[PDB]
Amino acid sequence: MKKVIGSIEFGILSPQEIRKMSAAEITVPDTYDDDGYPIEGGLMDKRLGVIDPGLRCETCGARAGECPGHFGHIELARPVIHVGFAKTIHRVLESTCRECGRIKLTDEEIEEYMQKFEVMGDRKGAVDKLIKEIHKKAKERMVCPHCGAPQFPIKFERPTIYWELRKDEEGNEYKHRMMPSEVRDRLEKIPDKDLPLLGLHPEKSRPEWMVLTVLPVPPVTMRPSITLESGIRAEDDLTHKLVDIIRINNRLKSNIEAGAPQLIIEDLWDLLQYHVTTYINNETSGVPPAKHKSGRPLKTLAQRLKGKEGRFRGNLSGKRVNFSARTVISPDPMISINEVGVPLAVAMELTVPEKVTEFNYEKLKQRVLNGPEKYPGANYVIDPEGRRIRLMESNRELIAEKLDIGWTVERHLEDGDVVLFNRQPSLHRMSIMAHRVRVMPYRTFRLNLPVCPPYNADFDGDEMNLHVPQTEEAQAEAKILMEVQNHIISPRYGGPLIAGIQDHISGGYLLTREGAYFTRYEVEQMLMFAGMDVNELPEPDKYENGEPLWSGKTIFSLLLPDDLTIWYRNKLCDEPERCEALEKLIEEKLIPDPEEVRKLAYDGFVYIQNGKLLSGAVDKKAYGREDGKLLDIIVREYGVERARQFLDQVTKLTIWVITHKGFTTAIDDEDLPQEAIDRIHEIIREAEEKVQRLIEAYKRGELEPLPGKTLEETLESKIMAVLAEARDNAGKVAERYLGMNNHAVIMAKTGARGKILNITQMAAMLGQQSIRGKRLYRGYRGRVLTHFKPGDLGARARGFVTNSYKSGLTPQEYFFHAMGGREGLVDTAVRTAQSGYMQRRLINALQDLKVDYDGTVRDPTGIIVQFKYGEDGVDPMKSWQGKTVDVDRVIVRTLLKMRG
Amino acid sequence: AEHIIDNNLLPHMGVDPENRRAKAYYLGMMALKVLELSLGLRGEDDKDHYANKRLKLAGDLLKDLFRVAFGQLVKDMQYQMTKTYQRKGERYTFENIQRFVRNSIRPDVLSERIEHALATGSWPGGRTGVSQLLDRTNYMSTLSHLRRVTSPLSRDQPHFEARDLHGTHWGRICPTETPEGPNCGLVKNLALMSQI
RNA sequence: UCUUAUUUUUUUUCUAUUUUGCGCCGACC
DNA sequence: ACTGTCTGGACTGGTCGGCGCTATGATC
DNA sequence: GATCATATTGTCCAGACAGT
């Protein structure tokens, strides 16, 4: 049968257990001889395992690559204090009597502490608090309650040095060094009944085991030895540390057997203690770390376990996996959000293991008969007994003829196969989704554009990874849970994440704007491009020059479901009167006539009645990320598959619109007439005059301190406020003098790409350059640059750039903008590390929380963190703008459904 | 304590006790600098101001590396002559003092300390990354690497006052050409008009 | 003209089936 | 019972590519 | 000449601790 590890019990290894688990005794501080063979009794002994392929292990008889490795033991001449337990040892040394060995507590106190230990349960914090309280109470008693022997304070010196404060016959206070043998002898006197009071297990954590008498040398496999390209074997750091330990132990044994004086024995004991302490942890405080002959410090077991590169993080929590690829991504609007572009070279390398059944026997037989060099083919074949055979040209037909039910065929990646698509860093669960394999003959990955905002991935050389599940359970889990269309709504804010961006928004605005009409050929072409099932063209809206014309709203209406009705305001609202009139007309009748709506239709108010876009222009508020109301309603009211189809169709339609109608930006997009430039210059002169007046008022002393502030930062804040008002006025002038016919203004207003400030910065001014939230001050004495007078606090001398990008900046203003950009870049480069550390901390704090079947969130111990998740038991992904149920939307939709 | 004061307390003033009194004078000019800022007589100087910042070039690092290598070579030669005198004796040592000194020298012991520091980029005294592989991607990269300046500050440390551009970098440090990520600000390039 | 020692049967073959580590530098997301 | 001081730990992830190092002073 | 034992022992935040 099969068994799993139900629980793990920790403890301290006893010397008897170390001796029993050891397959050999190590006494030679060497690894290999001149010819390269292992030395008997050495660290590289075959009894501890084999790394070289030729050798065969003595203990288990297995060759390299399959021998698990066997531990050894070293009999230390003298006991050595374990550093990791050392401080804990001191605690026990402050809790037990030096003669009787019992704890320094009364019987009643011991019993009361036993009841306290039994009552509280299994919470770790209470146990540590009780242990600390018991240690503090026992450490202040100088008389043993059981024997009456006097006690002395014990001073702990890092890392493994113990001093006992003793008194001579003359009353002088001196320090006696407690040798590890004396410490172990004192620890041996503590009975098993007092161990729970000290936080030690009677049968698993005996204090005498905290002092090392037998050192467990690791197996050969866990510290492997390799041969370099120069023919010289490269030993591990642990091997060198163990060589030093064995040499020092042998020297100590020889000196002890020779009757060496006490000066020799304690010196060698200290050397062995230092070696063992470095072997346990080379980064111990208060000691010099062990270094190689080249001056490189070694990393021992503690550094192997801890750290980012340690076993826990670099090998256990996260590790490299098989059947994975990684390459650059390129855009592909022609594929669905469910599909990923897999290169042919990647597809012919990564293989899906498919078992031969009664329905896929012919397909897998054809895959085997194609071979690894022909697509679609196979690379490996596994028989039911379990031998894997690689398919070459010779046995390609023979294996195909031998194929039967129960065999496994590692076939090439085919269309429709489910694979994982992950981009690093993975800040959220939406950073990986299961896509469908689409095989194309190029070299790069291809990912659909609406799936990019979930990945936070652009196409400026982004690298993305792909993982192919092997087991059927993993493939099913990827297909059902982590499918792309199932994660359109972001659980972080309950809004659309998989959404149209940039050119999708621009094409939607171009199609759905007022006065946008298309010919019959254009309408048929966009219908075919978007893959819509429109068999017959709708009635044309108007006839121009004898030919029919279709409104873009009519074409957009075919995407929406026939029973959809929603009205809202978008970001293109600048005349609230028309929007208010439309809202009032909708409010009275609740089913306004389409002719009545079209009479007073406004691009700033989106209104869809029965799937017909009667008014409004498409922008980021329609199906953009974090703002699309239409996409949010479509996902929640019509499922995810219909939402995915709508997203694909609308993205293709908008791409067709933006491709053939013509979308471009030029140098005249930021061009302004002479009146706008004159107004901007007037604003500049007014701002500099106000700044100079403020400076003069501060100099003459009539400037008023702000409440709680002195002259300097008050004047600085006033100057910054004046410059901000000037920047706002310049931006308002630029917006006034730039119409909606501008493509850059279209992109800024519709929310496709960029902002209004971006156009303002390229046309009107750059504003004031600020560092760390204040004006630029770092530089020379009294000035930032030497081109200004010292002590000048003017706008031009402190980072206020008057000209824009189109007019070109002065060298001083260019330098100030460089300081601002450098500050921004440093801000992001500093923020990323802190954000990642905080994310890791939060994840490790909340990794184990899970909603149970009764709706309660509990920790693995059993403590109910929440009796109901979110206090209402509602998924934030399925929540409506952070609310439980959108009563307004439900009522309106139901009323419209019953009225229609 | 005498050795510590002689070899650690302002070694740039000397190591002999005779100049010790003068070191006290150098202490006094420190105390004033501490006192005035504690009393408002003088302002705090900028650590990132280039008047207080020097640029160790390849010559100074080569001088330090050659000093370390020559000291180790000197100690090796001293051990070699000591061993030769202890083995052969006074007769063979002083019969030809020209050959005795020459044979007690191992030049490679010096050489393998210099070029190795120019190979791995590790410098004596804990300094590392001094020597790097020259970038040969194109004509621009090699010139940028040859006109590159690094900082001893750690890359993971947020140095808001050090990574940001300074007003004294005009004409000395390029205001725009900086690397991204943790290397931003701490790694700069010399300006076209910069003279050292 | 003299003490204080003992004694026995139930185990088989000419031999064998895919280099880590350390540290540096640079770049990308 | 407060207060400044000493000691200890962590410092986002991933990827591409390169460079370079991992003996020696006696002994017959 | 060819071998061989030995090869040294930067900041910031939080918890514990003498001092008043």
Ligand SMILES: [Mg+2]
């Ligand atoms: Mg990118």
Ligand SMILES: [Zn+2]
């Ligand atoms: Zn084995």
Ligand SMILES: [Zn+2]
């Ligand atoms: Zn006792």
